Amino acid sequence: FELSGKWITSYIGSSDLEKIGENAPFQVFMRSIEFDDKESKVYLNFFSKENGICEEFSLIGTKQEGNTYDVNYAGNNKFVVSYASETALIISNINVDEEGDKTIMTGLLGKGTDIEDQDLEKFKEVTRENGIPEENIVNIIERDDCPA
Numbered sequence: 001f002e003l004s005g006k007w008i009t010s011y012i013g014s015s016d017l018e019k020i021g022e023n024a025p026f027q028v029f030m031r032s033i034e035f036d037d038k039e040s041k042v043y044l045n046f047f048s049k050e051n052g053i054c055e056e057f058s059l060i061g062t063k064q065e066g067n068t069y070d071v072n073y074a075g076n077n078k079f080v081v082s083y084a085s086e087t088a089l090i091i092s093n094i095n096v097d098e099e100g101d102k103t104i105m106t107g108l109l110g111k112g113t114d115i116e117d118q119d120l121e122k123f124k125e126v127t128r129e130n131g132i133p134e135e136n137i138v139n140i141i142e143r144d145d146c147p148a
């Protein structure tokens with residue numbers, strides 16, 4: 001069961017709409033994730049937009065208790081890979097920004113642009129369980145025009 005490798009964002013959900021719209025810090029276009037269990041770290045590479053222009057990031061988080069990871073970006077973040085199939089990952093993240101406001105978010109990742117409904121139904125369920133309404137879900141594949 002390989003979790004490390006190429007991963008592209010298809011959908012994102014958020015308890016705070018301010019964090020996931022156009023040019024927001026969390027409209028994230030994932031490209032790859034590498035879990036380094038020997039050194040208890042995770043490597044994240046993705047694009048985001050500021051001023052409507054693609055910018056690339058490469059972050060390094062640290063593994064913490066209970067399969068969770070801490071990583072700094074637009075504040076402090078603690079996330080976990082809630083679900084994993086051969087075709088997708090569903091990540092749950094809690095962010096506390098510089099102002100101290102807390103936001104819970106979910107993301108569905110895949111190996112490309114062709115979504116499997118079975119994975120998508122699970123993403124919606126996890127999103128719902130986190131108290132996030134369907135109307136707070138954004139289609140990222142539709143918005144990802146950044147470099148491969």
Ligand SMILES: CCCCc1nc(N)[se]c1CCC
Nearest residue numbers: 028073077079091093106107
């Ligand atoms: C999984 C969708 C993006 C969530 C997410 N974006 C960041 N930037 Se840090 C965070 C933690 C999960 C890697």
